[PDB]
Amino acid sequence: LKSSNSLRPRSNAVIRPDFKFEDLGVGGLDKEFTKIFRRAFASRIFPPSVIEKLGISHVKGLLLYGPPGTGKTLIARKIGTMLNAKEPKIVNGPEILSKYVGSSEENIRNLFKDAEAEYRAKGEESSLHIIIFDELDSVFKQRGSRGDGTGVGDNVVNQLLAKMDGVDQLNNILVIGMTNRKDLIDSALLRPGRFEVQVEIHLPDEKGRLQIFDIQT
């Protein structure tokens, strides 16, 4: 299609206009959803012209943390498979490590290549890409701490840091992570530009219990 004179919404939108928070199937959390859907998926719906006249780039990170058995992975799944984007590149917790001397960092490098290629080839019309890290706190721990006697705890973190915000820019990705302990993740991974929006998901309220009960049955 072509953009006519009238400033009409993007052709291949991400969220579409027929969306409401009662279709997802996650009950209870309601303010968190407003925050998440304003901070992250609001700059990808406005026409590209105005967003280009403001000189702002989109957020490329999301962190969810909380107790065990609360709804983090459900949110990740629903966000991944109810949009208009490429298929997620799921990775389990310690699914990166390899046996040879230089194969782990390569495994962390191979996740971003399709996005790099398509951004280089097309530009601002590239479709959104998603990759979700599960159990983030397994390998990405504070650098220079006790443990990881083998020199792997540092190379991996350095590779991810250098690949998420480096000398070559990239703004068509969205990386989402989930954890039970945010006190062990590195301190350079939680700055604006890498995992900006961080959300805590707590136990449900009584009315939340009612909503969950109505959702299940």
Partner 1 sequence: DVGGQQIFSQALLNANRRGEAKTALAEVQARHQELLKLEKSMAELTQ
Partner 2 sequence: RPRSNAVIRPDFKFEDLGVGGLDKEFTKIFRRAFASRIFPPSVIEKLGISHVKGLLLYGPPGTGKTLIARKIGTMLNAKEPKIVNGPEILSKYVGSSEENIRNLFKDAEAEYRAKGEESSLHIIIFDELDSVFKQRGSRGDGTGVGDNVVNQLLAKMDGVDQLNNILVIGMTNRKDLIDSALLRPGRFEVQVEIHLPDEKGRLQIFDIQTKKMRENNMMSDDVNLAELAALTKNFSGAEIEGLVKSASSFAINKTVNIGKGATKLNTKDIAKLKVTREDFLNALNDVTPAFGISEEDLKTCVEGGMMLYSERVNSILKNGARYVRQVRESDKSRLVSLLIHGPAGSGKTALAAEIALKSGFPFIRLISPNELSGMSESAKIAYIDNTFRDAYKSPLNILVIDSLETLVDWVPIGPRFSNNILQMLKVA
Ligand X SMILES: Nc1ncnc2c1ncn2[C@@H]1O[C@H](COP(=O)(O)OP(=O)(O)OP(=O)(O)O)[C@@H](O)[C@H]1O
* 15 is a site residue for partner 2 (CB under 8 A): yes
Positions 140 through 179 that interact with partner 1 (CB under 8 A) = 149-150
First CA to last CA distance, the chain: 43
* 201 is a site residue for partner 2 (CB under 8 A): no
Contact 139, 97 (CB under 8 A): yes
Contact 96, 139 (CB under 8 A): yes
Contact 137, 185 (CB under 8 A): yes
Structure tokens at 183: 């006190």
CB of 79 to partner 1, least distance (A): 36
Among 6, 17, 100, 146, binds partner 1 (CB under 8 A): 100
Query: Between 106 and 200, whose beta carbon lies closer to partner 1?
Result: 106
Positions 181 through 210 that interact with ligand X (CB under 6 A) = 188
Which range, of 64-72, 79-87, 121-129, 150-158, touches partner 2 by CB under 8 A? 150-158
Alpha helices in 63-193 (DSSP H): 72-80, 104-109, 113-121, 155-164
Positions 57 through 76 that interact with ligand X (CB under 6 A) = 68-74
Q: Are strands 62-65 and 129-133 parallel, antiparallel or unpaired?
A: unpaired
Query: Between 152 and 184, whose beta carbon lies closer to partner 1?
Result: 152
With vertex at residue 118, the alpha carbon angle to CA 39 and CA 108, rounded to the nearest 5 degrees, is 75
The residue with its CB nearest to ligand X is 71
Neighbours of 179 (CB within 10 A): 20
x/- letters, 32..71, toward partner 2 (CB under 8 A): -xx--xxx-xxx-xxx--x--xxxxx-x------------
Is 192 annotated to bind a ligand? Reply is: no
Query: Between 98 and 171, whose beta carbon lies closer to partner 1?
Result: 98
H or E stretch at 174: strand 173-179
Decide: helix, strand or coil at residue 164: helix
* 26 is a site residue for ligand X (CB under 6 A): yes
Q: Which residues are annotated as a binding site?
A: 66-73
The residues of the shown chain that bind ligand X, judged by CB under 6 A, are 26-28, 68-74, 165, 180, 188, 212, 215
The residues of the shown chain that bind partner 1, judged by CB under 8 A, are 99-101, 149-150
